[PDB]
Amino acid sequence: SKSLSPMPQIAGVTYYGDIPKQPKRVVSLASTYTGYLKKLDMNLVGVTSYDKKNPILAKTVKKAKQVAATDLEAITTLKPDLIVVGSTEENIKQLAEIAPVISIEYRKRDYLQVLSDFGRIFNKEGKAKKWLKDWKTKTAAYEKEVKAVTGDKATFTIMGLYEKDVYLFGKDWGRGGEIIHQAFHYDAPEKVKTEVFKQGYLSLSQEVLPDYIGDYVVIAAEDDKTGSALYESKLWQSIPAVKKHHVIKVNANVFYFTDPLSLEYQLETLREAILSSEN
Ligand SMILES: [Cl-]
Ligand code: NA
Ligand code: NA
Ligand SMILES: [Zn+2]
Ligand SMILES: [Zn+2]
Ligand SMILES: [Zn+2]
């Protein structure tokens, strides 16, 4: 009985059932996408734990219930007309019995394309287009502002800390890489381009970190103590970028994401942090 989405065929997008064009009660089970749906003025009745822990996005979804993909009863009771999942979810069959499902395979469309793709699915092209135009202009302007500080050839490395582990990231695996490498067009060290960019991420032992850091490093973490032992180490303190105060420590609870709401916060945060590196 719902007016239907035109359900365009788009790389990475799979539809289960007849997707509504104008869903009124959306459950997002994919934190990668929740804020895209919010930007397009969807009514989110269910979101994920990650969404509730995202201090920027959470402010806009207070009325949504936190749910996990296993919460068949809670999701049913929310009476959704659309469920959104990532393609690695394992109970899509059961979810699609509750409501139509859109399943997205990560990385098939880039962080900007995802928004315009949802614009086509929901006939919200104008909202997507306006946001994307503003983003293009603003990021070009900000690229000039930050390269006025660093120079145009400065290298950046994206890093994240989790538990006792260290990771590097490329241009399209979160942690600020989309803004640093795609929006600001900062280069990365050669070793990062060669070893990290294709896969998107790389597990590293701490002792080799100096070899992967050039001018600047952006480091994501979920709490301000995860990195404490690393930061006090002689190894870390030996790195030229560290000596120069070219370390930018960011809050992973928002910096994991690439939705428009998270990005707006990240963009201003990174712009200000690059300026502040020269205080
Ligand atoms: Cl932050
Ligand atoms: Na966590
Ligand atoms: Na500023
Ligand atoms: Zn129950
Ligand atoms: Zn550029
Ligand atoms: Zn400096």
UniProtKB/TrEMBL annotation:
UniProt: Zn(2+) 1 binding residues: 18
Superkingdom of the organism of origin: Bacteria
GO cellular component: outer membrane-bounded periplasmic space
UniProt KW ATP-binding keyword: no
Binding site for Zn(2+) 7: 222
Residues involved in Zn(2+) 4 binding: 97
InterPro entries given in the database record: ABC_transptr_periplasmic_BD (IPR002491), Bact_iron-sidero_bind (IPR051313)
Compartment(s) where it occurs, according to its Swiss-Prot or TrEMBL record: Cell envelope
Keywords for this protein: Metal-binding, Signal, Transport, Zinc
UniProt binding sites for Zn(2+) 3: 90
Record carries keyword Zinc: yes
Residues at which Zn(2+) 8 binds: 232
Entry GO MF terms: metal ion binding
PROSITE patterns from the UniProt entry: FE_B12_PBP, PROKAR_LIPOPROTEIN
UniProt-annotated binding residues for Zn(2+) 2: 73
Positions with a binding annotation for Zn(2+) 9: 245
Residues annotated for Zn(2+) 6 binding in this entry: 165
GO biological processes: iron coordination entity transport
Positions bound to Zn(2+) 5: 143, 185
Annotated family: Belongs to the bacterial solute-binding protein 8 family.
Record PANTHER family: IRON III DICITRATE-BINDING PERIPLASMIC PROTEIN, IRON(3+)-HYDROXAMATE-BINDING PROTEIN FHUD
Name the UniProt record assigns to this protein: Iron-hydroxamate ABC transporter substrate-binding protein
Organism of derivation: Streptococcus pyogenes
